[PDB]
């Protein structure tokens, strides 16, 4: 049976090599030129390492989450702590913001994802429905105001339904940690990184893989999704971002500069998908061209790490929450 | 002009949260965290002491625990790099502990953490160097050889963090002062080595 698996895999490899880099096509197109940007506001409010920040859909708010035991709903126009949501799970490995600005998500080493309601009518911000996985919980996202697709270290992405708190579906088949996950803009299918170099795509409705991938040399820290849907980038622990594709079952370019050896920690595109941000581990934040890979402008501002990154839903203000308690809203 | 009321509405929230945070930080910076990897204690954290707090001389300790967590440790251990002392209860068998300890030491984010240690287990076929080493000795040879191996792993990286091997196998009544007194030293040395004075 293992020999038959090897034969089938050789067939898949032959097919994917017969159906095959965007540089040779886009080699004369006009470049973008040098570009740099400065910290417009410094959201210095935290008191521990900031591990995630889901930049809200309003393009104004943002929810940052830190291991201090706090969850502060910031602002990006006058820099005020609109809320200060305390948690019972002292650690937090991710936060999530509903698309209608109506909910937030949390949850880390304590294996439990939780839901805080901010648009309340009785004062205090209370936990709505904490739902529970055997393992940590390293991502959360929102399809609508009551559907969350968590990742886990349990190796199993598991779509939930907050009403009555059940696993509507349940995904599995990785044999390895599941670090990050994105969601398509039309919200119908979503990639899901892992710790086997396995950027296995999935389908939200049925509950099985559609066209997996494996093209990296180490685990995957964080993943993204092209603004349209017919592409998605990926970072790994070998200082490389790889612009994959989900229409051709392979990649289209590898981003790599021999001057750096470290591990990507979060990725996100621009609006036009032209500038591929990245949060490295030697404290900077490179920017990569779309089809003309080169480190154009380093946004080195931080001092300990770059734990996450985000871009407004209209491409206005990047914001990188490092490990020293200080966000920074570039522009 | 009606857009001049939400300004004060927002600044009052600002000035209330900048009065609650400056009163929560004064209890965040007065409790030191911990960690209890390597093995679940059940003899040093449940009967003698997933948080599990306690207090000695008006100071509190968030003695965490990862017992319910999985086996692959390369992802939920890089987010404990701000703790003060990674307690380490430990009892082939010993070579696995040694290869866990060497990795925790030479790690890049856990680099500057002062690993306390606990030989709760208080041989020659799995260790051939047992005869060519010298400090009833039927227990001292074994005990001090295990400890000498751990310290020979610890003294090869520096000077930012030292292993503090202890020993405990009895009822462990005063097994909390051995952590309090030995966590004071980590702050003392963390200041001395910074004042260029040690």
């Amino acid at each position, epitope marked *: 049976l*293992r020999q038959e698996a090897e034969q089938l*895999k050789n067939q898949i*490899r032959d097919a994917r090599k017969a159906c095959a880099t965007l540089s040779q096509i886009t080699n004369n197109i006009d470049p973008v030129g040098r570009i740099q940007m400065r910290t417009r506001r410094t959201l210095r409010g935290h008191l521990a390492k900031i591990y995630a920040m889901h930049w809200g859909t309003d393009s104004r708010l943002l929810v940052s989450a830190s291991q201090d035991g706090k969850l502060i709903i910031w602002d990006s126009y006058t820099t005020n702590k609109v809320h200060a949501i305390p948690l019972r799970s002292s650690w937090v490995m991710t936060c999530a913001y509903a698309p209608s600005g109506n909910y937030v998500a949390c949850g880390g080493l304590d294996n439990i994802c939780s839901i805080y309601n901010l648009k309340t009518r009785e004062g205090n911000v209370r936990v709505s429905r904490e739902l529970a996985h055997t393992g940590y919980l390293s991502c959360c996202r929102f399809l609508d105001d009551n559907q969350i697709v968590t990742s886990s270290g349990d*190796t199993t992405c598991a779509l939930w339904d907050i009403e009555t708190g059940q696993q509507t579906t349940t995904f599995t088949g990785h*044999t*390895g940690d599941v670090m990050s996950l994105s969601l398509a803009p039309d919200t119908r299918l979503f990639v899901s990184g892992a*710790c*086997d*170099a*396995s950027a296995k795509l999935w389908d939200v409705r049925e509950g099985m893989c559609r066209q997996t991938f*494996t*093209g990296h*040399e*180490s*685990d995957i820290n964080a993943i993204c999704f092209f603004p349209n849907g017919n592409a998605f980038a990926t970072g790994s*622990d*070998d*200082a490389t971002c790889r612009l994959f594709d989900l229409r051709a079952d392979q990649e289209l370019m590898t981003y790599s500069h021999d001057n750096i*050896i470290c*591990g990507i920690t979060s990725v996100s595109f621009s609006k036009s998908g032209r500038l591929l941000l990245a949060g490295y581990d030697d404290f900077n934040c490179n920017v990569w061209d779309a089809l003309k890979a080169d480190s154009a402008g380093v946004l080195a501002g931080h001092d300990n790490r770059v734990s996450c990154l985000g871009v407004t839903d209209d491409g206005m203000a990047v914001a990188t929450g490092s490990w020293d308690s200080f966000l920074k809203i570039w522009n | 002009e009606d857009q001049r009321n939400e300004e004060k509405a927002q600044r009052e929230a600002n000035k209330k949260i900048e009065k609650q945070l400056q009163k929560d930080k004064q209890v965040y910076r007065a409790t030191h965290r911990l960690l209890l990897l390597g093995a679940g204690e059940s003899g040093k954290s449940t009967i003698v002491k997933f948080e599990t707090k306690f207090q000695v001389d008006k100071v509190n300790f968030h003695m965490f625990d990862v017992g319910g967590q999985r*086996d*692959e*440790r*390369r992802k939920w251990i890089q987010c404990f790099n701000d703790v003060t002392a990674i307690i380490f209860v430990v009892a*082939n068998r010993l*070579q*696995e502990a040694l*290869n866990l300890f*060497k*990795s*925790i030491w*030479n*790690n890049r984010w856990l680099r500057t953490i002062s690993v306390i240690l606990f030989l709760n287990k208080q041989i020659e*076929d*799995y*260790f*051939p*160097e047992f005869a060519r080493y010298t400090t009833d000795p039927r227990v001292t040879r074994a005990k001090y050889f295990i400890r000498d191996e751990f310290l020979r792993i610890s003294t090869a990286s520096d000077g930012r963090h030292y292993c503090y091997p202890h020993f405990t196998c009895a009822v462990d009544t005063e097994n909390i002062r051995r952590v309090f007194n030995d966590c004071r030293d980590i702050i003392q040395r963390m200041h001395l080595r910074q004042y260029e004075l040690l």
Partner: nanobody
Framework: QVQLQESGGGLVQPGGSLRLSCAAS????????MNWVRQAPGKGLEWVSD????????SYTGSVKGRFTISRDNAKNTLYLQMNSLKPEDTAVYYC?????????????????????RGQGTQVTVS
């Protein structure tokens, strides 16, 4: 895709000599710290050897000092664990494991299951 296969092995009386190999392709080999791992049939995974990323800092377990000899090859993409003077308790499946991160000085690889850089593993026993 990363590929970590093995070779050699079989059934040999005590005092024999086996020279196992390991075919590593898919990733750059010159900067990943390797190590072998044996699993006694009927027991959990154990540790036997390792090596630095330049053949410099070889180590071993306790009861396998001196007998064996591990040596990489940073041009042919192989890892050879020359075995000498076997024993009754040296029967196990031998995996050609690896370590997760490039340019590392640590390993988190001897795990109960679910590791994606740990080959199928040949079998070596003693009669």
């Amino acid at each position: 895709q990363v590929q970590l296969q093995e070779s050699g092995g079989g059934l040999v009386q005590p005092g024999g000599s086996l020279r196992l190999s390991c075919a590593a392709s898919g990733f750059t080999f010159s900067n990943y710290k390797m190590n072998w791992v044996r699993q006694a049939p009927g027991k959990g995974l154990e540790w036997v050897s390792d090596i630095s990323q330049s053949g410099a800092s070889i180590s071993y377990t306790g009861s396998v000092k001196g007998r064996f000899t591990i040596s990489r090859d940073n041009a042919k993409n192989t890892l050879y664990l020359q075995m000498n003077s076997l024993k009754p308790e040296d029967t196990a499946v031998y995996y050609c494991a690896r370590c997760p991160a490039p340019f590392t000085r640590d390993c988190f690889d001897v795990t109960s299951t679910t590791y994606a850089y740990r080959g199928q593993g040949t079998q070596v026993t003693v009669s």
